[PDB]
Coordinates of C-alpha atoms and ligand atoms in Angstrom, one line a residue:
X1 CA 0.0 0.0 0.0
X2 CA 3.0 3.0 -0.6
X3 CA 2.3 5.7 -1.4
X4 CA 4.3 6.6 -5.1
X5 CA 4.8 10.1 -4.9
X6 CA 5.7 11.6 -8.6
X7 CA 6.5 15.1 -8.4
X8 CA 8.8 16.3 -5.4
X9 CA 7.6 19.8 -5.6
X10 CA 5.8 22.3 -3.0
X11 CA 2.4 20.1 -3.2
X12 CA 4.6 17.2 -3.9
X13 CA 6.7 17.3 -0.9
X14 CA 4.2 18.7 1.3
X15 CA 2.1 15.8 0.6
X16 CA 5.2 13.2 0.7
X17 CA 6.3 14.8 4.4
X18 CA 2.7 14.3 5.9
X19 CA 2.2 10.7 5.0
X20 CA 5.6 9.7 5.5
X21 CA 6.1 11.3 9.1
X22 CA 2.6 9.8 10.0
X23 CA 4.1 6.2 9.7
X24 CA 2.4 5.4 6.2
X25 CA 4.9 3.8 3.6
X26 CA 5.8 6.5 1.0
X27 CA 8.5 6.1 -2.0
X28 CA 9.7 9.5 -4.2
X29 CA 9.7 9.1 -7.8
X30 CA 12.5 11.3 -9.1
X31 CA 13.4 12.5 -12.2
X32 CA 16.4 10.5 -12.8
X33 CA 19.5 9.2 -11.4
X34 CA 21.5 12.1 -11.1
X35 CA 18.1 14.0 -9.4
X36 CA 18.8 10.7 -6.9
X37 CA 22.1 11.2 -5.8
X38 CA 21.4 15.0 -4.9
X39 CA 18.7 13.7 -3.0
X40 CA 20.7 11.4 -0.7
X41 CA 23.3 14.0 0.0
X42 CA 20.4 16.5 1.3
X43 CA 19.1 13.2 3.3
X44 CA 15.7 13.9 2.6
X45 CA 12.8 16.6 2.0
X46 CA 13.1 20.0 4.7
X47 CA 9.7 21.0 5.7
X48 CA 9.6 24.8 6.7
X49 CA 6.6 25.3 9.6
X50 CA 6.5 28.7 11.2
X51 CA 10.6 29.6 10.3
X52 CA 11.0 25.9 12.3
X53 CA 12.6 23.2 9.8
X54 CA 12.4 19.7 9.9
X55 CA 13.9 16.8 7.6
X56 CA 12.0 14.1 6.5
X57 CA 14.2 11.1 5.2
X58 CA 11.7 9.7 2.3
X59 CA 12.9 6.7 0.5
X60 CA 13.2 7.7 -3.0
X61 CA 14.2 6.4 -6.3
X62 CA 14.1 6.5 -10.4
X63 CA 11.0 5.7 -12.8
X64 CA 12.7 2.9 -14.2
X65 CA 13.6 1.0 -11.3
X66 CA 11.1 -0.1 -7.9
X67 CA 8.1 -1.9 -7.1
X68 CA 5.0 -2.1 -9.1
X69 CA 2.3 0.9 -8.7
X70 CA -0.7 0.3 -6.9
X71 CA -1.1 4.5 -5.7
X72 CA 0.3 7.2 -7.0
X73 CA 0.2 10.9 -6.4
X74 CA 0.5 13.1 -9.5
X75 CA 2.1 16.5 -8.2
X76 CA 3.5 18.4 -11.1
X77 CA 2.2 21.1 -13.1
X78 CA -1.0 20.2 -15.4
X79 CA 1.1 20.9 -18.5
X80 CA 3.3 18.2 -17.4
X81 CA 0.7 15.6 -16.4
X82 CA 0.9 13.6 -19.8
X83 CA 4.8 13.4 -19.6
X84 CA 4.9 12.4 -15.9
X85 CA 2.3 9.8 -15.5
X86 CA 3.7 8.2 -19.2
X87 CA 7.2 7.7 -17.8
X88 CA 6.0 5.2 -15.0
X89 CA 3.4 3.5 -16.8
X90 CA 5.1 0.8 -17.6
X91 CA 4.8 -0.1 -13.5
X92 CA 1.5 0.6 -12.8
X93 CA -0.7 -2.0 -12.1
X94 CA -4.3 -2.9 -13.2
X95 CA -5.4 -1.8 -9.9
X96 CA -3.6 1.0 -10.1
X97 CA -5.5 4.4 -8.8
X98 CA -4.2 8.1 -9.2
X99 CA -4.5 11.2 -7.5
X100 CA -4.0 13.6 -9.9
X101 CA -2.9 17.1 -8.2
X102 CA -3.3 19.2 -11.1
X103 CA -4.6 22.9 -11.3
X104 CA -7.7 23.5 -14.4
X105 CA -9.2 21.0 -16.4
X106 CA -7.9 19.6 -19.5
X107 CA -4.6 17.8 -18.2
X108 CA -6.6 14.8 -16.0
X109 CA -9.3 14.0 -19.2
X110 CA -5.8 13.8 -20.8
X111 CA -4.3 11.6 -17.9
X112 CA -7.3 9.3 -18.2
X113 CA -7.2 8.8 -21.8
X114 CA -3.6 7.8 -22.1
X115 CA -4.1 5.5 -19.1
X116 CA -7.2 4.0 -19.6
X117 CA -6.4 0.7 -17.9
X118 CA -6.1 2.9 -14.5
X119 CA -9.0 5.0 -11.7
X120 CA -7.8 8.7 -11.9
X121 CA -9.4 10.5 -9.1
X122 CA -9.5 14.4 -9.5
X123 CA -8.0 17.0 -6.6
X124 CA -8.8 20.6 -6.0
X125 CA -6.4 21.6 -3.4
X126 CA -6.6 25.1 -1.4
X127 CA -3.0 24.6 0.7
X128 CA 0.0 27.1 0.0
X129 CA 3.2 25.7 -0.1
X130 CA 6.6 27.0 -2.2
X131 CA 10.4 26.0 -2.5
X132 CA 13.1 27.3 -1.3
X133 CA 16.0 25.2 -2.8
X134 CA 15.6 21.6 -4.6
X135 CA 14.3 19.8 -1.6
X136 CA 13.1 22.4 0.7
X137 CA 9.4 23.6 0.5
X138 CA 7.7 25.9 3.4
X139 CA 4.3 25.2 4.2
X140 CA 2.6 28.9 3.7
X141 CA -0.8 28.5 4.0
X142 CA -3.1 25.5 5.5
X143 CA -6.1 24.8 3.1
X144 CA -8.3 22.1 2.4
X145 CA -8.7 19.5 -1.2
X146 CA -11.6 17.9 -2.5
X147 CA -11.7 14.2 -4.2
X148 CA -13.7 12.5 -6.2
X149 CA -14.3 10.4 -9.4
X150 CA -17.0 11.5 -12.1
X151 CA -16.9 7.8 -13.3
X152 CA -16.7 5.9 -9.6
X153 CA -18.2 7.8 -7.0
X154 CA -17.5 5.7 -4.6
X155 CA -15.2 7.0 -2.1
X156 CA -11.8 4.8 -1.6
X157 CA -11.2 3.4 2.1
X158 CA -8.0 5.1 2.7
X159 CA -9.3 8.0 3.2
X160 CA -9.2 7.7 6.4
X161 CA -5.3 7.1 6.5
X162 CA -5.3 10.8 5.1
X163 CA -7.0 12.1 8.3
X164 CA -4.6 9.8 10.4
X165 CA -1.6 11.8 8.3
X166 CA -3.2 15.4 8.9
X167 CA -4.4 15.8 5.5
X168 CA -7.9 17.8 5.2
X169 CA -10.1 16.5 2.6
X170 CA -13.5 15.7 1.8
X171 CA -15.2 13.5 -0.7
X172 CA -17.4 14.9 -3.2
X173 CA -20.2 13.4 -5.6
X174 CA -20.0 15.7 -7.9
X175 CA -15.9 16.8 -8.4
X176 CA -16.2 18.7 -11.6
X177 CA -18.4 20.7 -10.0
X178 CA -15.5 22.1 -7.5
X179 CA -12.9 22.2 -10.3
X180 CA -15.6 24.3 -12.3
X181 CA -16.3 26.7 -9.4
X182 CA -12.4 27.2 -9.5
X183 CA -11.9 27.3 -12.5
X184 CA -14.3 30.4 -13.3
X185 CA -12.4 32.1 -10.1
X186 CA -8.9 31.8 -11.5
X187 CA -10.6 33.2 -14.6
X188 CA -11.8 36.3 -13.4
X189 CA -8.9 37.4 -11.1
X190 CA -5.6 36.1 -12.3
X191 CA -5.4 37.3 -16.6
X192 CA -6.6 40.9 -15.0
X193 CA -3.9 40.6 -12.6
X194 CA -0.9 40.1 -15.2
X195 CA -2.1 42.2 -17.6
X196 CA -2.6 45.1 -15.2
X197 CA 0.5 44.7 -13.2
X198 CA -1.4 45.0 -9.7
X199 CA -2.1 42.6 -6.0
X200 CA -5.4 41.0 -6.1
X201 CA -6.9 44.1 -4.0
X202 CA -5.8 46.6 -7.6
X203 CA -8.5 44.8 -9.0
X204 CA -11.5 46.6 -6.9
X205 CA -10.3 50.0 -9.5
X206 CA -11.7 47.5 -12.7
X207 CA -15.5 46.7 -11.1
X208 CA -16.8 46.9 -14.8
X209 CA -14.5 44.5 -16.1
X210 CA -14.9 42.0 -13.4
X211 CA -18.8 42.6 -13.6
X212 CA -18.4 41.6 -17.3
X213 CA -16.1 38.7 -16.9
X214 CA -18.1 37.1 -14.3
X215 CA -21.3 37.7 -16.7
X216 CA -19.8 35.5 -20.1
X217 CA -18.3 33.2 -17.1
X218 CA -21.6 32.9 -15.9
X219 CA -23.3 31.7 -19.1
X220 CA -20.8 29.5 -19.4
X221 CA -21.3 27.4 -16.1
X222 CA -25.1 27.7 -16.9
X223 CA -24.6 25.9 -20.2
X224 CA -22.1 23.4 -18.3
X225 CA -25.2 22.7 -15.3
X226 CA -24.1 24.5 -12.5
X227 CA -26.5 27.0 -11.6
X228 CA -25.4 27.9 -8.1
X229 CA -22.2 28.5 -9.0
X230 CA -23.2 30.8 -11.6
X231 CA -25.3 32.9 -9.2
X232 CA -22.9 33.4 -6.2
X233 CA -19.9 33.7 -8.7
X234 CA -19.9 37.3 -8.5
X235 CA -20.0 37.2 -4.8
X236 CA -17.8 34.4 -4.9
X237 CA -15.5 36.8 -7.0
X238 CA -15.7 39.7 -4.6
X239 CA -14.8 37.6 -1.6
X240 CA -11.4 36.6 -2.6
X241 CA -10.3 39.9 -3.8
X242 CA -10.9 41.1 -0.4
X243 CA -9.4 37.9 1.3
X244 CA -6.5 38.1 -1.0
X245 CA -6.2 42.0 -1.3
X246 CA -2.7 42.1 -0.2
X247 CA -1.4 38.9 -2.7
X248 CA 0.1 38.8 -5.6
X249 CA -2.1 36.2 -7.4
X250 CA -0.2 32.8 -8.7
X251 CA -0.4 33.3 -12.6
X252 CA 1.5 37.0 -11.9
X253 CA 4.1 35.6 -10.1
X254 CA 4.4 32.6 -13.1
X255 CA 5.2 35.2 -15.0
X256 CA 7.1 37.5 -13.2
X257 CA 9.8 35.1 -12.1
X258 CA 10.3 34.1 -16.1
X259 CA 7.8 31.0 -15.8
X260 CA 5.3 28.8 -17.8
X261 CA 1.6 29.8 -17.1
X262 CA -0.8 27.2 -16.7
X263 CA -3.4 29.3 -19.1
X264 CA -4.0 26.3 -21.4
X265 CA -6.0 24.4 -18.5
X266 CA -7.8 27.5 -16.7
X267 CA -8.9 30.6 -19.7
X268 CA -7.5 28.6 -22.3
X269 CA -9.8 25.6 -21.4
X270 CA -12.8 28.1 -20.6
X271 CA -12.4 29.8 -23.8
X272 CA -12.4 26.4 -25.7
X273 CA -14.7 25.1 -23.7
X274 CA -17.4 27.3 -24.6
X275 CA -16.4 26.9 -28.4
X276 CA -17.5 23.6 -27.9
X277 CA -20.9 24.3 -27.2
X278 CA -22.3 27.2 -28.7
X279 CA -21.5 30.2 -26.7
X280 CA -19.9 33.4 -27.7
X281 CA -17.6 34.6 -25.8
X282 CA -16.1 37.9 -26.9
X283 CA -14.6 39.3 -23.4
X284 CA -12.8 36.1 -22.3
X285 CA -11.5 35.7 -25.8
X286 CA -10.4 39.1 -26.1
X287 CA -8.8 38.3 -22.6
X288 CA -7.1 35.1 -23.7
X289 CA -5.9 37.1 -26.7
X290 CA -4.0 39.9 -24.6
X291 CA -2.9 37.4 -21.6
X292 CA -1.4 35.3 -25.1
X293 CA 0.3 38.2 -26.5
X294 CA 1.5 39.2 -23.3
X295 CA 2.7 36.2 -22.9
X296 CA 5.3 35.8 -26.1
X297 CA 6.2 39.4 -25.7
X298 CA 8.3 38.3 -23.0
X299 CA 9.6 34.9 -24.7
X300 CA 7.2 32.8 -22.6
X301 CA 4.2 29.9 -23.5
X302 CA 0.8 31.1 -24.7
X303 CA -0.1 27.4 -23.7
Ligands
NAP401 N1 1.9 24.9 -4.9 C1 0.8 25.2 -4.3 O1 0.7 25.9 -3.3 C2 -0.5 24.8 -5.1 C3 -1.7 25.1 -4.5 C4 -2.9 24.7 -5.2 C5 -2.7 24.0 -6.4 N2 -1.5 23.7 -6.9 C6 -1.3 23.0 -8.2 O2 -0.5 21.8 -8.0 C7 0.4 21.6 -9.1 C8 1.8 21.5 -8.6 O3 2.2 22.8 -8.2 P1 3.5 23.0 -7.4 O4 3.6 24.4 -6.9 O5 3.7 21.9 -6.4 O6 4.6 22.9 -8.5 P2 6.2 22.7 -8.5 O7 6.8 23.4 -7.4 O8 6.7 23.2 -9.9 O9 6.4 21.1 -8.4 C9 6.3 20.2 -9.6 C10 7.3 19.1 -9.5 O10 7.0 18.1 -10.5 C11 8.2 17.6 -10.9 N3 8.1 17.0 -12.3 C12 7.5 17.6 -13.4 N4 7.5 16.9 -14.4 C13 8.1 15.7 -14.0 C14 8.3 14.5 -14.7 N5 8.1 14.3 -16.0 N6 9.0 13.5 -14.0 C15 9.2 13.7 -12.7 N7 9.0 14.8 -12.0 C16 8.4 15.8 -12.7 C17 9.2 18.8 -10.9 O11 10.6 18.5 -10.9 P3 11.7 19.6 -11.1 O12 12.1 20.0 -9.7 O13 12.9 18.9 -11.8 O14 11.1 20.8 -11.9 C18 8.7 19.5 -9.6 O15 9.5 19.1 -8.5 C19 0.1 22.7 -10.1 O16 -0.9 22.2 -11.1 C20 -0.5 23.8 -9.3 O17 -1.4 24.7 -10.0 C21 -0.4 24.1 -6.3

């Protein structure tokens, strides 16, 4: 029953150092060899609490080597999914059940296609954590992550064993619900927030544009069957710019440390999304159109 842990990032580790220090068996998959042997000098994964750091000495090892895969815990970025869960799919087995971490949608429909013979269960996590060197992450915020399976929505028994490790979570029926409701709130705030150069709180000086955002991102989660979230999403909206007035949101600091921006699976799947169907969409494509070319005007991903 370990724990395969692909991914030693801020989620990654944070995830890794919880299980592991609550006496549950937990192995690191990392990248390669060489990633191995900078991993055993450190002597494991430094978790930062309150300026207090602790090391956690987490087996590790390579995808090519170790046991067969029975659970696995996808923790990179969603435009990495494909790659990562490819390169150990030659151990997993046919009972094999992933968590996939990811932010958006688009990157675990992907992840379930290419492993078809495996249960991918879908996360929406709310915990803050960053690195600070290769294997030290600080655990900034606490927050809580949803599961749940649109195809098997029965809930897995080791649940539990995630309360046992300090892990908040809860179980929902209805997952892509969550990831939706997400989804539209990463939409509204964080293209504003790179294209205007501003915190979360600059945002309250653009009420019109966030009024007419949350309007074509309403009709879109009316067409998709979530009606309540399209009627609190303003309110929704409102609440976490005041909550996060003083923040820097995450897609700004993606690009202001030189980074990839996961816009392919948040505005870029809402934009496409709604091409699907039938809806136009003119103020999230204009939207996606500036957030692109703002994008390659500094040499980085539009996708
Ligand atoms: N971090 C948060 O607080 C937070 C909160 C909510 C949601 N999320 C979501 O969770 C996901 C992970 O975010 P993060 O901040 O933890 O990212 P991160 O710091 O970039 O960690 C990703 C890790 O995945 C590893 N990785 C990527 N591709 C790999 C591959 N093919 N094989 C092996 N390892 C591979 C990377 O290794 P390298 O070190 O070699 O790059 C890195 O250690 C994102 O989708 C994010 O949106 C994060």
């Amino acid at each position: 029953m370990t724990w395969h842990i692909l991914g030693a990032g801020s989620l990654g580790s944070l995830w890794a150092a919880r299980l592991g220090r609550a006496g549950l068996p937990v192995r690191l998959i990392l990248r390669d060899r060489q990633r191995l042997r900078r991993y055993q000098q450190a002597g494991g994964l430094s978790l930062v609490e309150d300026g207090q750091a602790s090391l956690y000495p987490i087996a590790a090892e390579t995808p090519d080597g170790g046991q067969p895969i029975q659970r696995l815990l996808l923790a990179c970025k969603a435009y990495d999914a494909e790659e990562a869960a490819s390169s150990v799919a030659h151990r997993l087995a046919g009972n094999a059940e992933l968590l996939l971490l990811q932010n958006g949608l688009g990157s675990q429909q992907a992840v379930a296609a290419r492993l078809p013979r495996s249960r991918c269960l879908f996360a929406s996590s709310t915990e803050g954590a960053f690195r600070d060197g290769d294997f030290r992450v600080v655990f900034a915020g606490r927050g809580h992550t949803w599961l749940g399976d649109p195809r098997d929505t029965n809930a897995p028994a080791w649940l539990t064993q995630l309360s046992q490790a300090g892990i908040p979570h809860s179980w929902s029926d209805d997952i892509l619900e969550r990831l939706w409701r997400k989804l539209a709130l990463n939409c509204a705030i964080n293209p504003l927030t790179v294209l205007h150069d501003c915190r979360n709180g600059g945002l309250r000086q653009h009420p019109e544009e966030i009024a007419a955002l949350c309007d074509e991102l309403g009709q879109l989660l009316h067409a998709s069957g979530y009606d309540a979230a399209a009627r609190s999403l303003l309110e929704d909206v409102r609440a976490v710019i005041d909550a996060t007035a003083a923040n820097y949101s995450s897609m700004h600091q993606d690009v202001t440390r030189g980074r990839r921006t996961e816009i392919g699976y948040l505005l870029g799947y809402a934009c496409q999304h709604g091409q699907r169907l039938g809806l136009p969409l003119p103020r999230l494509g204009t939207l996606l159109a500036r957030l692109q070319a703002h994008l390659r005007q500094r040499g980085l991903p539009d996708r």
